Structure formats: C-alpha cells, structure tokens
Amino acid sequence: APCAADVLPGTWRIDAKYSNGERFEGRLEVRPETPTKFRIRIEGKDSNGKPSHKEGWMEVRTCTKVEVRVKASTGEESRGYMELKSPYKLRLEAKTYDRTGHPVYKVEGHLERIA
Numbered sequence: 001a002p003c004a005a006d007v008l009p010g011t012w013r014i015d016a017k018y019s020n021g022e023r024f025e026g027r028l029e030v031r032p033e034t035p036t037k038f039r040i041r042i043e044g045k046d047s048n049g050k051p052s053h054k055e056g057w058m059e060v061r062t063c064t065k066v067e068v069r070v071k072a073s074t075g076e077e078s079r080g081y082m083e084l085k086s087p088y089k090l091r092l093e094a095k096t097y098d099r100t101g102h103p104v105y106k107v108e109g110h111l112e113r114i115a
Contacts, residue, residue, distance in 0.1 A: 003063040004084040008038055016109030023047045036060040075099035088113040
C-alpha cells in the first residue's frame, strides 16, 4: 500500500473536534520540503464562524504515520500524529498547549484530500 508521504502534498479538508467541546472546520495545505518533511498551513473556523490559522511542519515516522507540529500566533502549539487510513484519508490526534506549555485540549479529526 502507498505510504503517507506519497499522498500528503496538496490540499486537504479538515474537520476536527476538541476535548473542550469546540470544533474546527477548514483546509490544510501541504508543501514538500524534503523527502521526510513537509510544511503545512491550516486555515478554518470554529462553530461560531471565528477564523483561526496555524502553521508548522509534518515529519514522516512510519509508512502510515506522520508527526505534526503547528503553532498559532497566540503562542499555542499543537503536536500529534496523522495516520493514513486510505489513499485520500487521514486521522488526526493531537494535544494543544498554551504559551507556558500547559495542556489546554486534545484534538481528534479527519482529513480528506481535495487537491
């Protein structure tokens, strides 16, 4: 089966839910940097329409798993993994930390590739 690295570049739709009951919907754009590393940008909205933006990187861990680390301008950092479930679908699990490194919520999401 194809590895995550082979199918990652392009644009993905993201739908995520947080452990604090908030939600996120938007798009993730993945650009290749090196064979094992990708730059990512995330843009979307919460359930009241409020926009949010994150940027960061993804690094290959296994044929099906990539590590993701992103930051917001608030100073919040998120770190987790995405697992390839099909040629066009990833499952996300991550933890978000505030500026001082205290955990604020956990994130679970599904991504599907649209370009």
